[PDB]
């Protein structure tokens, strides 16, 4: 269905679920090829031109963190963020809690952690809904939310008051803090000793 921006989004994610068995493998083994797939061009046209590259740099880094940190594979996070990795990457130190696509003049937020009006995944039914439309069902520590950090788990009061995602510049490597990550949530994070 190519009736406007909403159709482009729904179809992009439908294509990923449809092709997930091959897409998974390529994501693991040959990501440049996956990111360069011409099927991500439509989605990319909806991503604000001024920030596409940074978004991609950001998402490419998260994906590498996931590849490097054993046991942190997260299918829905990979599916959600994948189209944003299709831009030529530009680096920054910026942390994004949401990634915007432009739908008829409106800037729609795809939240990096969790569900949003654009990307809603039902963990029980395994159904992915995209702006109201079914994109299909998925057949069966957070390493791909913040750039340079792992989310270790729920808030640990011992590490004190929660920082905003913006105040994490001040952490040393190996250091941990609570972070207001989005929604009602505070989570314990650790700045990584490795770069990805």
Author numbering: 538 to 677, 686 to 741
Per the authors:
Each segment is packaged in a ribonucleoprotein complex (RNP) together with the nucleoprotein (NP) and the three subunits (PA, PB1 and PB2) of the trimeric RNA-dependent RNA polymerase, which mediates viral transcription and replication in the host cell nucleus. The PB2 residue at position 627, which in nearly all human and avian influenza strains is either a lysine or glutamate respectively, is the best characterised polymerase determinant of host range and virulence. Here we extend the structure-based exploration of host determinant residues through the identification by random construct screening of a new PB2 domain (residues 538–693) that contains position 627 and is thus denoted the 627-domain. The 156 amino acid 627-domain is located between the cap-binding and NLS-domains and contains six of the seventeen host species determining sites described within the PB2 subunit: N567D/E, I588A/V, T613V/A, K627E, T661A, T674A/S where for each position the consensus human and then avian residues are given.
We have also determined the structure of the complete C-terminal region of PB2 (residues 538–759) which contains both the 627-domain and the NLS-domain. The 1.95 Å resolution structure of the double 627-NLS-domain (residues 539–753) shows that the two domains pack side by side forming a single module. The well-structured part of each domain shows only minor differences from that observed in either the isolated 627-domain (RMSD of 0.5 Å for all Cα atoms of residues 540–675) or the NLS-domain in complex with importin α5 (RMSD of 0.78 Å for all Cα atoms of residues 694–738). Only the inter-domain linker (residues 678–692) and the visible part of the bipartite NLS (residues 736–741), both presumably flexible, show different conformations. The inter-domain linker comprises two parts: residues 678–685 form a poorly ordered, flexible region while residues 686–692 form a well-ordered interface between the two domains. This interface comprises 11 hydrogen bonds including one salt bridge (Glu687 to Arg650) as well as burying hydrophobic residues on helix α5 of the 627-domain and on the NLS-domain. The complete C-terminal region, comprising both the 627-domain and NLS-domain, also includes the host variable residue R702K and, in the inter-domain linker, the HxN2 subtype host determinants S682G and S684A. The atomic structures reveal that all seven of the host-determining residues are located on the surface of the double domain. A superposition of the double 627-NLS-domain structure, assuming it to be rigid, on that of the NLS-domain complexed with importin α5 via the common NLS-domain shows that there would be a significant clash of the 627-domain with the C-terminal region of importin α.
